[PDB]
Design a protein around this ligand. Structure first.
Ligand SMILES: *[B]([O])([O])[C][N]S(=O)(=O)[C]C1=[C][C]=[C]C(C([O])=O)=[C]1
Length: 244
């Protein structure tokens, strides 16, 4: 067995080498562990960015604003990324992190119902303000990494206050990787309309044996960083800890 000094040093080095600052929080049962090169980030608020898609989708499905097979049609207007210029389900929009689709869903839900559901879930600071289509991108909604891993822990275990079927539909949308009989469920986030920019990967490992290990990586993205650094640092960290 590797010392935890070694674990903490190895995981800190993954952040150091990506030349960023960040934290990965791992929950094992009820025990939270904080790793990385900027531990104090663990209890600081950031916009949830596209991590909010998880709750956005729970809210919309529970409230019959969409079904899992409905196709959100591209309206033909130029999008920020050409990959978004196509027709997609909530599932496909989740994988592509297609903001316009999740904005449409937010608009269907409406400000009033959205506010009620976010308070009911008590997600982050629970504050959505007045614009139903961008509160998760630029504020006022904010959340700590500890809160994000706890949200992930809830979803993984079907503990959120939504039907089981709602939760299962959403979890099916989040499978991003399989590694030696482990499945990684997670949602990326990248908040580019805040400064500094925040990057997220929040989810859980479902191990071969049934155990679900939640995690939230939170870091600072800067210009010319690749998105996949969030993934790379996560996988390296989970492997270093023998979680995958
Ligand atoms: B959300 O935070 O992922 C949306 N962020 S974005 O629209 O500013 C840029 C973007 C596009 C596609 C994928 C990502 C990502 O986070 O994986 C981000």
């Amino acid at each position: 067995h590797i010392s935890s000094q070694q674990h903490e040093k190895a995981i800190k080095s993954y952040f150091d080498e990506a030349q960023t600052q960040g934290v990965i929080i791992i929950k094992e049962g009820k025990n939270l562990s904080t790793y990385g090169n900027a531990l104090a980030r663990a209890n600081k608020e950031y916009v949830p960015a596209s991590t909010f898609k998880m709750l956005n989708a729970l809210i919309g499905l529970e409230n019959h604003k969409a079904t899992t097979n409905e196709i959100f049609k591209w309206d033909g207007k130029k999008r920020t990324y050409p990959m978004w210029e196509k027709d997609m389900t909530l599932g496909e929009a989740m994988a592509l992190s297609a903001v316009p689709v999740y904005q449409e869903l937010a608009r269907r839900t409406g400000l009033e119902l959205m506010q009620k559901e976010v308070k009911r879930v008590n997600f982050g600071n629970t504050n959505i303000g007045t614009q139903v289509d961008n509160f998760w991108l630029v504020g006022p909604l904010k959340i700590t990494p500890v809160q994000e891993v706890n949200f992930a822990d809830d979803l993984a275990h079907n503990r959120l206050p939504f039907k089981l079927e709602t939760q299962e539909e959403v979890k099916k949308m989040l499978l991003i990787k399989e590694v030696n009989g482990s499945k990684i469920y997670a949602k990326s986030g990248w908040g580019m309309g805040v400064t500094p920019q925040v990057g997220w990967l929040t989810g859980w490992v479902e191990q071969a044996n049934g155990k679900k290990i939640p995690f939230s990586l939170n870091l600072e993205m800067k210009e010319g960083m690749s998105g996949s650094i969030r993934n790379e640092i996560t996988y390296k960290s989970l492997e270093n800890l023998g979680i995958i």
